[PDB]
Symmetry: C3
């Protein structure tokens, strides 16, 4: 009882990114060409061990059409058991935050053709997960990743989240805490994301907020944190499924008063569905980041085909 | 409706390459051992979307037995739609020239066990392709690759070709044009290849000519171009299928008069067929390159097994 | 007639490695976290060609859950024919020594959770193999790897082995000879391993001895060789299968008298079997290496899940 599964997706995209410097336009960087949107092929399977305890595993990989990908299991792969008790898995895993919201429904490579900039913190990691069974629309999940798997200048992280559905309604919560962290160091960093909306058929709408907190190792040890929000909504007419999403990131908070710049973006799109599996898509995007006076503004257009087999 | 397909092929080969320097033999480089002939495994699938419009995709990879290969989609992989209208595909593709001739029927790793030296220009690239349906034995194809996918010091290329069959007879044409190009720069480079022959069952024979043209960026801006030809023929007796191919490359043309050397090669071989899928092969090759006075001459022998599943 | 096969295995492990320096403890290096035990996915297939001659191939790869693996065919992959005559294969192969003993039944990544230190010489290589059919419990195998596949500072190696079973009883022999060899050079190096034991159902016990001989390129050209032994035994109660293995490496022999240190290790474990395919495992290990006065001592604990599909 094994399954070959995958998704194949690519198309043509184009961008332009205009720089400002407090007076007038500094430097443009146009580009256009064909990109793969993130195709993957994976294998998964399960075995019935009896009394409703079942064993599960999967190995999944990035299979870019362009041939740029390499390696096995670069995506979500694992081994675990599943049961009335729940489903426990270990392996490399989507982090609990990443499951939380379809923050980005888009298929695109470029960062201006989906609400990508709020999903940078979502990740996959080597960890243990307990995923809860659903009672009345409540489910829950927690996972952990030990220091040694994280590394020398990184510390164990904890992730937890909860999920709620009452028919159309839903709400989801996901959070993360890491003792220590570093970049080419910050401490006691947490992130909490909450999403809610309505998704019955013929009606999708959602909004969620991400708050991130980190304490800088400064010689001022300055608290910092950054907030962002996003709203997406689409309704499906017949075979055609228009959608649009918006996102803002308020200025970061540095030692005290907001010092960092804020970024606004909006994406408008459609997908036409040939079949449940094959659907063909079209996108266009706008982003302005940083202050109004000395900014950065970019725009892009994306069209693509997707086949899930 | 997915398919696992592949070809597995390897065997023992051996070579020797003797250098001359206008007087007498300079330096020999013998080598012998086992090589993989280029095994691949791929996945492909299609879905019927109705009214004879069908959606297709594939991801294909090099799967060398020796373990030397790495990555996903390093070979011809794509997503496209197929129809009465034609078949349009996008992704990484065999170039239209590469489909043109079975210039090399051989399986070998070494370059002296197939007519490899006329197939150096065949390639695969990230592009769009329109492939024509067949009316009376005519089909046609065109594809394009944009500057950005090509790169910083390379320019979009255009490929076109046409195909003809009347029973045994066939003829094929394939061409390529690229505005700009570079090596660790040439311009306005084109190549045209024409092949024709007869291939019914029990009779294969073919010949084709490749003309290549490039203008050097010189401080003489000197036109250059190079011509080559090849003839292959094999006939099948029962289960055994002898074949032989020959190839010559006339001297290149440099600024004016031919300055470059010309290379002659000939390959003689056989394949015994266990089954439609498994066939076992044997080869021997000769190549002399460069001038007669101060040349390079090499020879080699190849034996192999092939299984297409 | 193709098969997707594989094994998926991972779990949590932990170690500590204490160093001594002729007086008292120098330096400890603790580590704990989750490791993949060596999962693989492969494809294999065969075709009946008639009169009991069958053609076989396989391509196999390391598919670590953590995503650390890359490439195709990194494990045992080949193409060969199989028959009443025997089975001949060529490709990258397990070496004949490696097939000889289940010297290591363990699943672990760490080297202290299986009898790993006697299996360092087992390898895989690009070679030809003849594997013998079984008459009365005798089978035999030989293979060869040519200089060029081995490399510039390595020389062809020869491998041979024989196998015996009379019901519970078994005995196996495997050996290797290589003319020349090098490290970042030794000569005329051989290794011989003999294993015997009893394995009917509900009773496994085994012991084997590995002798290795190499002549150093020294300006004393000093003969050297090293011996090691291992014993493993497990019996299966119902669904639970305790096992324990021990290993010692006598001091190496250098020019004359034993100069090198000897390493002792012992591993104790169990596996609980959910199903023929899925089984869950638990391990604990001890190793002391080097002399008693100024040693190295390490210990570790391993728990894991395994699914063979």
């Amino acid at each position: 009882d094994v399954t070959l599964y995958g998704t194949i997706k690519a198309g043509v995209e184009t961008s332009r990114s205009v720089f400002h410097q407090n007076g007038q336009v500094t430097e443009v960087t146009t580009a256009t060409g064909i990109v793969d949107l993130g195709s993957k092929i994976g294998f998964k399977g399960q075995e019935d061990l009896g009394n409703g305890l079942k064993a599960i595993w999967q190995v999944e990989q990035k299979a870019s059409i362009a041939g740029t990908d390499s390696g096995w299991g670069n995506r979500q792969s694992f081994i675990g058991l599943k049961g009335g008790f729940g489903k426990l898995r270990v392996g490399r895993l989507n982090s609990v935050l990443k499951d939380t919201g379809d923050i980005n429904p888009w298929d695109s490579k470029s960062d201006y053709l989906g609400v990508n900039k709020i999903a940078e913190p979502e990740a996959r990691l080597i960890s243990v997960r307990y995923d809860s069974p659903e009672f009345a629309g409540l489910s829950g999940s927690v996972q952990y990743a030990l220091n040694d798997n994280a590394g020398r200048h990184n510390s164990e992280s904890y992730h937890a989240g909860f999920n709620y559905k009452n028919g159309g309604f839903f709400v989801q919560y996901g959070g993360a805490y890491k003792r220590h962290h570093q970049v080419q160091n910050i401490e006691k960093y947490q992130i909490h994301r909450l999403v809610s909306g309505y998704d019955n058929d013929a009606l999708y709408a959602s909004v969620a907020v991400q708050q991130q907190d980190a304490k800088l190792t400064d010689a001022s040890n300055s608290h910092n944190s950054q907030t962002e929000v996003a709203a997406t909504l689409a309704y499906r007419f017949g075979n055609v499924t228009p959608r649009v999403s918006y996102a803002h990131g308020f200025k970061g908070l540095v030692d005290d008063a907001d010092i960092g710049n804020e970024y606004d973006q909006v994406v408008v799109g459609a997908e036409y569905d040939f079949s449940k599996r094959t659907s063909a898509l079209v996108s266009a995007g706008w982003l302005q980041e940083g202050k109004g006076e000395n900014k950065f503004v970019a725009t892009a257009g994306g069209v693509g085909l997707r086949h899930k087999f």
